[PDB]
Write a protein that binds this ligand. Structure first.
Ligand SMILES: Cc1cc(=O)[nH]c(=O)n1[C@@H]1O[C@H](COP(=O)(O)O)[C@@H](O)[C@H]1O
Ligand SMILES: Cc1cc(=O)[nH]c(=O)n1[C@@H]1O[C@H](COP(=O)(O)O)[C@@H](O)[C@H]1O
Lengths: 215, 215
């Protein structure tokens, strides 16, 4: 990922989302698009962004259903042009395998979300996260998401998945995570509001990149 | 819910989804619409169904993000005309509260998914399910989802939530659950493929209702 920075584009208006993404395009080459934008503007927004910006698109859909439904969700998401999809591991191995099967059929990638970044993640997810990660390894998952807000947990996730696996990390900026510390363990950081709510998103992205190059 | 039966409309084509829903409308008055249909046909499908069929719509979006994103997802879903949304409890109390806050602002309902119906649910979700349910009670959740495939677990969920709470249950038919047994504990059953993949969906729905009235 260009500059190890992934934009979390969670504005809910097509015009604002296009404006911000265009302003920061030189600093990124991967955009994470989730349900706030998709449920407001339609799945066609994925192919529009892919074309206009020539970026890779990660669909952050936190897929968390039974295996049969997960297959349908993944098929629709890849048909819409997403390069990868984020999948929850908490629903278990069969649900993750269903997503892996569709990604294999369509030449795409799955990212497994193993521990979340918000405070509530401590209640149930944290205590399962190591086992969710190990499940990922045993299923052959190569791409993972873990939390910038808890770098000791990010270190433990990296320990389980090994150095060859790709690890991206949200919670930088707004949720309190630090870019440099997070990049001790993650390959790339995800940043949303610290960029897209800034008075000058390009200057915000540049500031982050400047602190990244210093590592 | 009319006849204690909720149609899980997970066909991915608007014409087929409209045909089946129209054929079974006399047997139901609540349609559950999820991401297979929404990500294939757009969020506008919710208002279309609500109008054409005069049904209640439950958006089965298994909301499972951080609190800030959950608020955006719920706002977009209610703006699209959904009467209620299904929310995962596994991400913790703050994530569930975010959904409850938006439902309160917009005069809608949250259904909390506490234990899932597929085999993988045994790995991580089952061991947290009682505590997820108790969390729901403490947050004031009044609507719950639990698994037809494990009626002993459905009984335990009913025990925690009490008789006044509303409980709906998927996994009937295709996944192996039984309508009558499930309705010992749930107020309503969700049925998808046993109806929408049948040669005659109306006859399939009628058959289920006939076995329900017998209780
Ligand atoms: C992928 C994900 C997992 C998670 O544990 N935490 C998280 O924030 N996310 C998403 O990353 C983005 C974080 O954005 P900011 O906090 O930087 O605004 C939002 O899209 C969240 O939904
Ligand atoms: C709500 C939900 C939770 C869950 O634990 N199990 C489940 O099947 N679902 C959904 O119910 C429906 C079950 O459909 P059939 O198995 O009856 O086809 C699908 O939409 C599933 O995504």
């Amino acid at each position: 990922v260009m500059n190890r920075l992934i934009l979390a584009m969670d504005l809910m208006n097509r015009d604002d989302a296009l404006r911000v993404t265009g302003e920061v395009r030189e600093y990124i080459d991967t955009v994470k698009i989730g349900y706030p934008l998709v449920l407001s503007e339609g799945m066609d927004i994925i192919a529009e962004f892919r074309k206009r910006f020539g970026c890779r698109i990660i669909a952050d859909f936190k897929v968390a259903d039974i295996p049969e439904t997960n297959e349908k969700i993944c098929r629709a998401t890849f048909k819409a042009g997403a390069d990868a999809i984020i999948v929850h591991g908490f629903p278990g191995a069969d649900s993750v395998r269903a997503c892996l099967n569709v990604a294999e059929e369509m030449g795409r990638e799955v990212f497994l979300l193993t521990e979340m970044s918000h405070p509530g993640a401590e209640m149930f997810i944290q205590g399962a996260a190591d086992e969710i990660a190990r499940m990922g390894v045993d299923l052959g998952v190569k791409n993972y998401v873990g939390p910038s807000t808890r770098p000791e947990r990010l270190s433990r996730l990296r320990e389980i998945i090994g150095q060859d696996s790709f690890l991206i990390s949200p919670g930088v900026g707004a949720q309190g995570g630090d870019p440099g510390e997070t990049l001790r363990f993650a390959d790339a950081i995800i940043v949303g509001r610290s960029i897209y709510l800034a008075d000058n998103p390009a200057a915000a992205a540049a500031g982050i990149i400047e602190s990244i190059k210093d590592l």
